[PDB]
Structure 1
Amino acid sequence: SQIPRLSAINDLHKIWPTVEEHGAAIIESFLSLDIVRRLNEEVDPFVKIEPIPAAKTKDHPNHVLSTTTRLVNVLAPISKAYREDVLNSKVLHRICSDAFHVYGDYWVLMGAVMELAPSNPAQPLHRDMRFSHPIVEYLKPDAPATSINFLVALSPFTAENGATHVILGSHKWQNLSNVSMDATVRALMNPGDALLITDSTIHCGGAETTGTETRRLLTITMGISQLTPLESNLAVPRPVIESLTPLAQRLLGWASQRSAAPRDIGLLTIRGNSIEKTMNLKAEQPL
């Protein structure tokens, strides 16, 4: 059984139900080729100057990613396509509101570009969030997923160049005895396609075998606003923040948040008022 593939336009209402059942789905043409081009252009130089994940110069080194991975997060200050087109994706927001309605508001836990050098080895099969949010492991096994991960191809995903592996149905597994590469299928994707998984879906980046292709992706981890993001936008210039939509501002932690509790008292509030009301935060102001 292969990963179900869905149209971002026509099959919109089926995307989250598909992931909820099978643990993965491919959203064909999630981002247009044009958004992909612009995003690639914008992040290019920052990918190039990015050192190894556990570089000695970092005070939060990432010891888990391979030395042949480059990860660049906090994309808003770096990319117009990201902070405008991506953060406002209608497809993304329908899926996220489908997925997280039982909990309340959601935001970006991390939006990162990942680039894999030629001959990058495959990752060990894993679930996300275990190196940042121990709390997730203590949730009841049937609790609705508290984060999901959009893995957006920014270049072709082939079997040959290390397209992602997923184990369909593994988001519901409790006993991990059958975890093996034998159980996986591949996410073959064109640029702009997206693989959508939950935080319980067992998956791994694939082994790059050509020795010449450089595979790149945009990973967008969306999570309930009750969970702390992996990345901070606190240092993003106010002019940039005030160029965004109110929705994009909330996704980046520049607005208060709400839970779904009937008499919700809110998150990140200030003596009963919102961040944005308190700071008189403007929105949609061109730079």
Structure 2
Amino acid sequence: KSQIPRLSAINDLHKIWPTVEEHGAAIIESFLSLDIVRRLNEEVDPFVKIEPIPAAKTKDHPNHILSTTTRLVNVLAPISKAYREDVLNSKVLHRICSDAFHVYGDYWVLMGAVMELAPSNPAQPLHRDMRFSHPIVEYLKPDAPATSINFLVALSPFTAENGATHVILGSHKWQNLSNVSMDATVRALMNPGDALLITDSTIHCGGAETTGTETRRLLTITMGISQLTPLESNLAVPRPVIESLTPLAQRLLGWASQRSAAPRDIGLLTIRGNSIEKTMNLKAEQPL
């Protein structure tokens, strides 16, 4: 069985989305530089350490799906300069997203999260993303272009023994799911900064951590059309932080109006014919 296609962020940029459209997955080698990975890790480190269990009794939106040995930290913009500057303005990410979502229009971040898997973390069941948040997605026609995609960026090594992600190539086109099995999977073996890109229809799962010693960390960036509601809110992010961002980063975090691809688009999140950013006089690229 064939392995996940591996592509250069530098050289093969136009090939990335077409590869994912055909095969359901691709590995983007050095999607983030080692420097960006270093800074991201350093900045999110304490927030991962203080994060409670996914279904903590203190939470009013507990995640009952993730293993108790998973820590997920989202709303990364206030935590991480590297995320809000380097990642949110990634040339590679934006080329891929504009390739993927041109039929629909603007896209934004549905969720940007750091996930840390503890040693001995079990494999997840094979799944498609979005089914615990967006029931609408299951009602889309088979040939509907993907309305979200997920960049699974390695922040530490992904190996077969420490639980590297499994994917079933071609499974994004499957209607009948009788042949869903771990027998059909291949692995996303990745160095820090490499990213596995999948669609919302790609069948996949986190792998089993079998060493009992290694802690695997990733940055999962679910990008989706601006017509779908994000899993996370940036409403509470301080205005100085938002005003330090590029206009593009502001749009990605829901601090701007959005546009569809309809020929005479009337827009999303508008205010009496004007944008959020025009109405609120929102500044951009103002240093803290």
TM category (shorter chain) comes to over 0.9
Q: CA deviation at 1:32?
A: 0.1
Q: 1:59: Cα distance to partner? A: 0.2
Offset of residue 28 of structure 1: 0.1
Kindly state the Cα deviation for residue 118 of structure 1 after the two structures are TM-superposed.
0.1
The TM-score normalised by the length of structure 2 is 1.00
CA deviation profile, 1:253-281 (whole Å, cap 9, x unmatched) = 00000000000000000000000000000
Gap regions ≥5 residues in structure 2: none
Residue 94 of structure 1 and its aligned partner are, at CA, apart by: 0.0
How far apart, in 1, do the equivalents of 2:224 and 2:71 lie? 23
CA RMSD of aligned residues (A): 0.2
Q: CA deviation at 1:72?
A: 0.1
1:8-59 Cα deviation digits (max 9, x unpaired) = 0100000000000000000000000000000000000000000000000000
- Name the counterpart of 2:102: 101
Q: Alignment length, in residue pairs?
A: 287
Please give the alpha-carbon distance, in whole angstroms, between the structure 2 residues aligned to 1:122 and 1:150.
19
TM superposition shift of 1:227:
0.1
Matched, 1:158 2:159: yes
**Identity over aligned residues, as a percent?**
100
Gapped regions of structure 1 (runs ≥ 5): none
Shift of 1:171: 0.2
What does the per-residue CA deviation read over 1:234-254, in whole Å, with 9 as the maximum and x for residues that have no partner? 000000000000000000000
User: SS at 1:283's partner residue?
Assistant: coil
CA deviation vs aligned residue, 1:135-175 (integer Å, no higher than 9, x gap): 00000011000000000000000001000000000000000
- SS of 1:110's equivalent? strand
CA distance in 2, matches of 1:63, 1:160: 26
Q: Distance in 2 between matches of 1:134 and 1:217?
A: 25
Give the whole-Å Cα distance in 2 for the aligned partners of 1:218 and 1:39.
9
Secondary structure at 1:250 match in 2 = helix
**Partner-residue secondary structure (3-state), 1:39:** helix
CA distance in 2, matches of 1:261, 1:91: 25
Q: Distance in 2 between matches of 1:279 and 1:108?
A: 21
CA distance in 2, matches of 1:5, 1:16: 12
- Superposition deviation, residue 282 in structure 1: 0.1
String of CA shifts for 1:188-210, please: whole Å, max 9, x gaps. Answer: 00000000000000000000000
> 1:178: Cα distance to partner?
0.4
Q: Could you say which residue in structure 2 is the equivalent of 1:49? A: 50
Aligned to 1:254: 255
Output the CA distance in 2 between the equivalents of 1:28 and 1:245: 26
CA distance in 2, matches of 1:179, 1:243: 46
Q: Helix, strand or coil for the counterpart of 1:145?
A: coil
Report Cα offsets for 1:81-131 as digits up to 9, x if no partner: 000000000000000000000000000000000000000000000000000
